[PDB]
Amino acid sequence: MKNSKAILQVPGTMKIISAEIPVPKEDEVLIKVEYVGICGSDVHGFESGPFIPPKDPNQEIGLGHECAGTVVAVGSRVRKFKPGDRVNIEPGVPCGHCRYCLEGKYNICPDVDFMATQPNYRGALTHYLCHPESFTYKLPDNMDTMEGTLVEPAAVGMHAAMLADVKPGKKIIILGAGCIGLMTLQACKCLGATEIAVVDVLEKRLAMAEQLGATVVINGAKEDTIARCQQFTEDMGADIVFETAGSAVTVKQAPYLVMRGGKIMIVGTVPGASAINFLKINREVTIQTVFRYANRYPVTIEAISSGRFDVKSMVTHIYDYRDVQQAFEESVNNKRDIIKGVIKISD
Numbered sequence: 001m002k003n004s005k006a007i008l009q010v011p012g013t014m015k016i017i018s019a020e021i022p023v024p025k026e027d028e029v030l031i032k033v034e035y036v037g038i039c040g041s042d043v044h045g046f047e048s049g050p051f052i053p054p055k056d057p058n059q060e061i062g063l064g065h066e067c068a069g070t071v072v073a074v075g076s077r078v079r080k081f082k083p084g085d086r087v088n089i090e091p092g093v094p095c096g097h098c099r100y101c102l103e104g105k106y107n108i109c110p111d112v113d114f115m116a117t118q119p120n121y122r123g124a125l126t127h128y129l130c131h132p133e134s135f136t137y138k139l140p141d142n143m144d145t146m147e148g149t150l151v152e153p154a155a156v157g158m159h160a161a162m163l164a165d166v167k168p169g170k171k172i173i174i175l176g177a178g179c180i181g182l183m184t185l186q187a188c189k190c191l192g193a194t195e196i197a198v199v200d201v202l203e204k205r206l207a208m209a210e211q212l213g214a215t216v217v218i219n220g221a222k223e224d225t226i227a228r229c230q231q232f233t234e235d236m237g238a239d240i241v242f243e244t245a246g247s248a249v250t251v252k253q254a255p256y257l258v259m260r261g262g263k264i265m266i267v268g269t270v271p272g273a274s275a276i277n278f279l280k281i282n283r284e285v286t287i288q289t290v291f292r293y294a295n296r297y298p299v300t301i302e303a304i305s306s307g308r309f310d311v312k313s314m315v316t317h318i319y320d321y322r323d324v325q326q327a328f329e330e331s332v333n334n335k336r337d338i339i340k341g342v343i344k345i346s347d
């Protein structure tokens with residue numbers, strides 16, 4: 001009957017204020033949010049605010065973009081969905097008419113409306129929200145709304161592996177065993193790769209990498225990453241190197257890890273500049289940045305529903321919605337022990 005939202009009142013400080021229940025436009029669904037994931041971008045938003053200040057002096061800055069729930073109402077022209085459907089949402093709604101949308105790259109649309117961002121700052125941390133039916137997806141019966149929430153980061157890794165043309169016979173190195181690195185690992189497995197090395201510095205993440213199917217795990221703090229990778233690839237380098245931690249160490253490392261003619265994929269981020277040794281990759285190596293996802297939700301939902309892609313095992317912490325402040329503090333303070341945290345929104 002009533003709504004509320006968690007707002008970034010000032011960087012580092014969340015609270016929950018009242019909000020009106022949105023009315024779905026004729027092509028939208030109205031969803032009762034049940035789970036909201038916490039990823040790097042939300043934690044950075046909590047710490048710094050959005051990097052474009054709101055045009056409005058006292059704009060209510062929402063947070064959260066990975067979410068799922070149950071349809072409560074639908075707009076008058078919605079046929080795909082009905083009240084009671086459990087769904088997730090793809091949080092980036094592109095313009096649909098620019099050169100990039102029309103060319104199959106809507107993810108890089110210059111007018112994408114992405115949750116908890118620039119023009120509108122609509123956060124998924126709320127009891128009720130509206131979303132276009134075209135970017136909402138029904139969950140299989142064997143997939144709960146917490147799994148539906150984690151389709152979004154899984155889609156990030158799926159898009160990277162698909163962009164990279166992962167295939168059997170391609171040796172893969174994944175730099176980073178955080179959430180996105182583990183998603184990329186499982187995506188590489190779904191695309192048939194059989195030799196996957198995963199590099200991180202935390203033994204708990206490498207334990208999870210091995211559980212999720214890494215062929216070899218390498219602790220860059222206790223081992224020589226370049227030497228161990230050269231052994232892994234028989235001194236030839238890997239066909240594909242994924243950089244997923246967004247750190248300077250890893251990006252600068254990837255040139256030394258890839259084979260001639262191979263690919264380096266930068267899965268998101270990299271906030272600072274990084275010095276690249278192009279001499280080491282002068283034989284037609286490709287470096288490509290990877291940005292969110294395009295047309296990946298169905299195949300990712302498929303992969304999770306089948307059991308081949310395990311997102312439930314990645315959830316290490318579940319926070320109640322009214323405890324959202326601690327959820328974001330711990331996501332900063334105890335980053336060491338969190339693979340993936342989610343926020344449960346019950347009444």
Ligand SMILES: [Mg+2]
Pocket residue numbers: 039065066152153
């Ligand atoms: Mg995400």
Ligand SMILES: [Zn+2]
Pocket residue numbers: 094095096097098099100101106109110111112
């Ligand atoms: Zn567009």
